């Protein structure tokens, strides 16, 4: 799919993300524009060979099943391609957990620099929720 600004982000609050586990509502949609640019089908492999998947940019190395990453933990227990499709109804049970890791956003790279020290509510702003 291709999501709009106010249209790609109303479903997180549909998936337990409002102020979930220490992270506030303004702190989320920013990074989505920073990892696959509001696009779910944007997947990319890394120099490190762990293919990242989805708008989320998750590597096949630590989190999912692609078969080209051996010794991969695959803790999420879901085929990597189980996210990218138009319905992401389940894609978040893993991200909802990737934070309890005690690293939280430590996994995501874009935010820590592009959304860190930012005006996060400036992203959640103008939209009715
Ligand atoms: C630049 C890029 O996409 N790198 C990814 C990052 O998105 C992801 O959070 C990380 C998890 O360990 O795998 C890679 O570092």
XYZ file of N, CA and C and ligand atoms in Angstrom:
402
model
N 0.829 -1.185 0.000
C 0.000 0.000 0.000
C 0.877 1.253 0.000
N 0.225 2.396 0.021
C 0.829 3.702 0.101
C -0.037 4.515 1.068
N 0.493 4.867 2.229
C -0.312 5.570 3.229
C -0.062 7.066 3.270
N -1.098 7.804 3.651
C -1.056 9.253 3.727
C -0.521 9.600 5.079
N -0.302 10.891 5.340
C 0.231 11.367 6.612
C -0.692 11.043 7.772
N -1.933 11.535 7.713
C -2.903 11.295 8.782
C -3.570 9.919 8.630
N -3.280 9.205 7.534
C -3.936 7.925 7.295
C -3.110 6.678 7.635
N -1.798 6.807 7.712
C -0.939 5.655 8.006
C -0.771 5.414 9.496
N -1.139 6.443 10.302
C -0.861 6.445 11.745
C -2.046 6.338 12.703
N -3.255 6.145 12.224
C -4.378 6.051 13.158
C -4.564 4.623 13.669
N -3.903 3.672 13.021
C -4.025 2.267 13.385
C -3.092 1.825 14.516
N -2.111 2.653 14.912
C -1.239 2.239 16.033
C -2.021 2.254 17.335
N -2.923 3.232 17.461
C -3.723 3.374 18.663
C -4.832 2.333 18.624
N -4.799 1.556 17.549
C -5.690 0.444 17.304
C -4.964 -0.818 17.738
N -3.664 -0.652 17.986
C -2.791 -1.748 18.371
C -1.995 -1.553 19.660
N -2.602 -0.926 20.670
C -1.970 -0.792 21.972
C -0.772 0.108 22.114
N -0.553 1.002 21.158
C 0.622 1.869 21.181
C 0.464 3.180 21.935
N -0.755 3.587 22.280
C -0.847 4.860 22.984
C -0.203 4.719 24.353
N 0.894 5.458 24.521
C 1.660 5.504 25.762
C 1.967 4.102 26.248
N 2.259 3.204 25.309
C 2.508 1.834 25.698
C 3.933 1.663 26.162
N 4.083 1.020 27.315
C 5.386 0.691 27.858
C 6.383 1.845 27.808
N 6.026 2.939 28.462
C 6.884 4.078 28.621
C 7.058 4.941 27.399
N 6.472 4.548 26.261
C 6.631 5.392 25.084
C 5.331 6.103 24.777
N 5.446 7.404 24.579
C 4.305 8.247 24.345
C 3.860 8.220 22.878
N 2.633 8.683 22.688
C 1.931 8.753 21.417
C 2.601 9.617 20.354
N 3.309 10.671 20.754
C 3.968 11.550 19.784
C 5.241 10.919 19.236
N 5.780 10.008 20.022
C 7.036 9.338 19.778
C 7.005 8.227 18.721
N 5.873 7.978 18.053
C 5.888 6.846 17.132
C 5.939 7.116 15.630
N 4.934 7.798 15.095
C 4.783 7.986 13.639
C 5.956 8.675 12.977
N 6.728 9.381 13.756
C 7.853 10.099 13.216
C 8.769 9.128 12.463
N 9.208 8.085 13.152
C 10.161 7.111 12.616
C 9.668 6.348 11.397
N 8.365 6.213 11.247
C 7.828 5.465 10.114
C 8.207 6.137 8.791
N 8.275 7.456 8.837
C 8.640 8.288 7.692
C 10.153 8.223 7.534
N 10.781 7.650 8.562
C 12.211 7.537 8.625
C 12.766 6.121 8.453
N 11.924 5.115 8.192
C 12.462 3.752 7.979
C 12.038 3.076 6.666
N 10.886 3.448 6.121
C 10.439 2.925 4.821
C 9.561 3.938 4.078
N 9.526 5.160 4.633
C 8.845 6.342 4.086
C 7.343 6.091 3.785
N 6.591 5.739 4.829
C 5.135 5.448 4.798
C 4.790 4.303 3.860
N 5.779 3.479 3.567
C 5.594 2.377 2.650
C 5.918 1.050 3.329
N 5.015 0.092 3.195
C 5.219 -1.199 3.816
C 6.078 -2.118 2.965
N 5.950 -2.025 1.630
C 6.700 -2.897 0.701
C 8.177 -2.505 0.534
N 8.657 -1.524 1.303
C 10.060 -1.116 1.186
C 10.946 -1.922 2.141
N 11.557 -2.980 1.592
C 12.422 -3.894 2.334
C 13.823 -3.833 1.770
N 14.831 -3.891 2.640
C 16.194 -3.786 2.152
C 17.188 -4.644 2.901
N 18.145 -5.205 2.159
C 19.177 -6.023 2.767
C 20.315 -5.140 3.242
N 21.043 -5.595 4.247
C 22.118 -4.782 4.800
C 23.475 -5.302 4.371
N 24.528 -4.500 4.560
C 25.858 -4.970 4.169
C 26.138 -6.229 4.960
N 25.544 -6.250 6.130
C 25.653 -7.300 7.118
C 24.818 -8.527 6.739
N 24.113 -8.427 5.627
C 23.358 -9.530 5.062
C 22.053 -9.844 5.745
N 21.768 -9.179 6.833
C 20.505 -9.459 7.475
C 19.520 -8.662 6.707
N 18.613 -9.315 6.036
C 17.681 -8.525 5.277
C 16.691 -7.922 6.229
N 16.468 -6.645 6.063
C 15.532 -5.941 6.901
C 14.197 -6.124 6.216
N 13.086 -5.984 6.927
C 11.782 -6.187 6.290
C 10.734 -5.180 6.770
N 9.900 -4.730 5.833
C 8.836 -3.801 6.115
C 9.232 -2.358 6.314
N 8.225 -1.556 6.637
C 8.405 -0.161 6.938
C 9.202 -0.092 8.214
N 9.095 -1.171 8.979
C 9.753 -1.301 10.254
C 11.263 -1.514 10.112
N 11.710 -2.040 8.975
C 13.143 -2.281 8.781
C 13.732 -3.269 9.801
N 13.151 -4.475 9.894
C 13.629 -5.516 10.824
C 14.544 -6.532 10.119
N 15.705 -6.839 10.700
C 16.624 -7.778 10.045
C 16.290 -9.239 10.353
N 16.468 -10.063 9.333
C 16.197 -11.497 9.348
C 17.149 -12.214 10.296
N 18.165 -11.472 10.701
C 19.223 -11.919 11.581
C 18.720 -12.262 12.991
N 18.167 -11.264 13.704
C 17.729 -11.460 15.080
C 16.261 -11.809 15.222
N 15.408 -11.128 14.477
C 13.996 -11.264 14.716
C 13.163 -12.234 13.867
N 13.371 -12.364 12.523
C 12.431 -13.244 11.778
C 13.048 -14.360 10.889
N 12.118 -15.059 10.178
C 12.315 -16.226 9.294
C 12.417 -15.900 7.785
N 13.617 -16.024 7.204
C 13.799 -15.812 5.751
C 14.639 -16.948 5.142
N 15.313 -17.666 6.019
C 16.122 -18.809 5.710
C 17.524 -18.492 5.237
N 17.795 -17.234 4.891
C 19.139 -16.919 4.416
C 20.005 -16.457 5.562
N 19.374 -16.267 6.718
C 20.088 -15.896 7.922
C 20.084 -17.065 8.894
N 21.124 -17.873 8.801
C 21.308 -19.021 9.682
C 21.780 -18.585 11.066
N 21.429 -19.366 12.081
C 21.820 -19.032 13.449
C 20.937 -17.892 13.926
N 19.968 -17.531 13.081
C 19.056 -16.472 13.414
C 18.156 -16.985 14.507
N 17.881 -16.132 15.450
C 17.078 -16.537 16.565
C 15.634 -16.766 16.147
N 15.043 -15.808 15.444
C 13.641 -15.935 15.063
C 12.755 -16.042 16.299
N 12.863 -15.051 17.155
C 12.099 -15.005 18.391
C 10.651 -14.631 18.133
N 10.437 -13.827 17.112
C 9.102 -13.338 16.767
C 8.197 -14.484 16.352
N 8.809 -15.526 15.800
C 8.105 -16.718 15.337
C 7.027 -16.406 14.288
N 7.380 -15.534 13.326
C 6.493 -15.137 12.210
C 7.290 -14.922 10.931
N 6.779 -15.394 9.781
C 7.554 -15.230 8.550
C 7.686 -13.747 8.296
N 8.871 -13.352 7.913
C 9.194 -11.967 7.724
C 8.172 -11.327 6.773
N 7.770 -12.079 5.774
C 6.825 -11.616 4.751
C 5.405 -11.504 5.299
N 5.260 -11.856 6.557
C 3.982 -11.802 7.232
C 3.678 -10.380 7.682
N 4.583 -9.454 7.396
C 4.330 -8.082 7.788
C 3.948 -7.223 6.571
N 4.840 -7.236 5.593
C 4.830 -6.410 4.400
C 3.482 -6.307 3.700
N 2.636 -7.305 3.823
C 1.358 -7.256 3.113
C 0.515 -6.090 3.636
N -0.549 -5.735 2.892
C -1.397 -4.594 3.241
C -1.934 -4.678 4.664
N -2.214 -5.884 5.174
C -2.692 -5.933 6.550
C -1.540 -6.247 7.510
N -1.321 -5.312 8.411
C -0.268 -5.357 9.412
C -0.842 -5.614 10.807
N -2.074 -6.127 10.844
C -2.791 -6.384 12.079
C -1.936 -7.099 13.132
N -0.949 -7.899 12.722
C -0.132 -8.627 13.705
C 1.330 -8.169 13.796
N 1.792 -7.419 12.812
C 3.190 -6.990 12.736
C 3.724 -6.397 14.035
N 2.855 -5.858 14.855
C 3.300 -5.209 16.068
C 3.450 -6.083 17.310
N 2.926 -7.334 17.361
C 3.152 -8.094 18.617
C 4.622 -8.249 18.897
N 5.440 -8.194 17.852
C 6.862 -8.335 18.061
C 7.464 -6.981 18.484
N 7.092 -5.898 17.788
C 7.625 -4.564 18.112
C 7.154 -4.115 19.486
N 6.017 -4.654 19.899
C 5.417 -4.373 21.201
C 6.274 -5.023 22.275
N 7.094 -5.953 21.829
C 7.951 -6.699 22.705
C 9.419 -6.260 22.581
N 9.833 -5.859 21.371
C 11.228 -5.484 21.095
C 11.738 -4.386 22.030
N 10.818 -3.712 22.690
C 11.148 -2.649 23.613
C 11.391 -3.160 25.043
N 10.637 -4.192 25.465
C 10.749 -4.775 26.831
C 12.125 -5.370 26.993
N 12.775 -5.446 25.872
C 14.084 -5.944 25.701
C 15.018 -5.208 26.673
N 14.592 -4.019 27.108
C 15.385 -3.179 27.985
C 16.263 -2.259 27.158
N 16.109 -2.366 25.850
C 16.804 -1.499 24.917
C 15.817 -0.551 24.327
N 14.559 -1.027 24.242
C 13.538 -0.200 23.685
C 13.980 0.130 22.273
N 13.795 1.374 21.940
C 14.095 1.950 20.658
C 15.571 1.738 20.271
N 16.408 1.206 21.214
C 17.833 0.920 20.928
C 17.978 0.090 19.685
N 16.924 -0.612 19.320
C 16.974 -1.419 18.129
C 16.827 -0.524 16.914
N 15.896 0.423 16.983
C 15.666 1.288 15.837
C 16.732 2.352 15.796
N 17.285 2.533 14.615
C 18.357 3.463 14.410
C 17.890 4.864 13.997
N 16.937 4.963 13.065
C 16.530 6.287 12.561
C 16.055 7.247 13.658
N 15.156 6.799 14.493
C 14.633 7.628 15.574
C 15.693 8.238 16.468
N 16.585 7.403 16.959
C 17.628 7.799 17.885
C 18.374 9.014 17.391
N 18.351 9.238 16.090
C 19.048 10.390 15.594
C 18.101 11.415 14.955
N 17.164 10.928 14.136
C 16.210 11.775 13.415
C 14.985 12.173 14.246
N 14.589 11.329 15.182
C 13.413 11.611 16.009
C 13.776 11.864 17.469
N 15.056 11.792 17.770
C 15.549 12.038 19.123
C 15.892 13.507 19.252
N 15.460 14.143 20.327
C 15.771 15.564 20.473
C 14.920 16.360 19.516
N 13.823 15.741 19.095
C 12.910 16.336 18.144
C 11.632 16.904 18.783
N 10.801 17.451 17.898
C 9.499 17.988 18.175
C 8.483 16.956 17.762
N 8.526 15.836 18.446
C 7.716 14.688 18.123
C 6.223 14.981 17.996
N 5.639 15.791 18.871
C 4.192 16.045 18.744
C 3.870 16.775 17.441
N 4.908 17.283 16.790
C 4.761 17.995 15.532
C 4.385 17.031 14.418
N 4.419 15.737 14.736
C 4.079 14.675 13.792
C 2.634 14.195 14.007
N 2.264 14.104 15.269
C 0.956 13.639 15.715
C -0.068 14.769 15.673
N 0.434 15.951 15.389
C -0.336 17.169 15.366
C -1.194 17.284 14.099
N -2.318 17.996 14.238
C -3.256 18.273 13.157
C -4.220 17.156 12.830
N -4.042 16.023 13.495
C -4.870 14.870 13.222
C -5.781 14.557 14.411
N -6.996 14.134 14.089
C -8.024 13.800 15.073
C -7.876 12.351 15.533
N -7.799 12.159 16.852
C -7.611 10.821 17.388
C -8.301 10.628 18.742
C 20.010 1.112 8.482
C 19.118 -0.064 8.820
O 18.028 -0.281 8.312
N 19.648 -0.918 9.794
C 18.855 -1.942 10.548
C 17.898 -1.284 11.587
O 16.693 -0.682 11.001
C 17.482 -2.347 12.609
O 16.875 -1.619 13.706
C 18.652 -3.234 13.113
C 18.304 -4.217 14.228
O 19.431 -4.791 14.832
O 19.080 -3.962 12.007
C 19.820 -3.019 11.176
O 20.690 -2.334 12.083
